[PDB]
Amino acid sequence: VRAKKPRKARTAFSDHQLNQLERSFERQKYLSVQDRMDLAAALNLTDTQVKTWYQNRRTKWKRQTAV
DNA sequence: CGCTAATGGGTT
DNA sequence: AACCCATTAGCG
């Protein structure tokens, strides 16, 4: 049942990282490439981890908007 | 299970 | 390139 393609380990975000990602999201639902890279740098996260966090946060946000 | 990080497969 | 968003899957 295991994938043939290697998947990345699941990142566990710190409370500090989640607090800052949530503050960023409340302010701006979409980030410029520069604002995203800068946030990744400030939090010692990868660009992709921040990009994906934003994407999955927008999914969650759209589901709450629908109720 | 529930939440949500990462990925698939297609769109913008 | 980044997004959309259904899906796959890790873990408390």
Numbering used by the authors: 227 to 293
Q: What do the authors say?
A:
Here we solved high-resolution (<1 Å) structures of MYF5 and BARHL2 bound to DNAs containing sets of dinucleotides that have different affinities to the proteins. The dinucleotides were recognized either enthalpically, by an extensive water network that connects the adjacent bases to the TF, or entropically, by a hydrophobic patch that maintained interfacial water mobility.
However, the non-polar contact between Thr278 and T7 has a more optimal distance. The water network is also more extensive, with three more water molecules. Those water molecules connect the side-chain oxygen of Thr278 to both O6 and N7 of one of the observed conformations of G8. The DNATG complex also shows very strong distortion of the DNA backbone, with a 3.7 Å shift between two conformations of the phosphate backbone at the position of the G nucleotide located after the TG sequence.
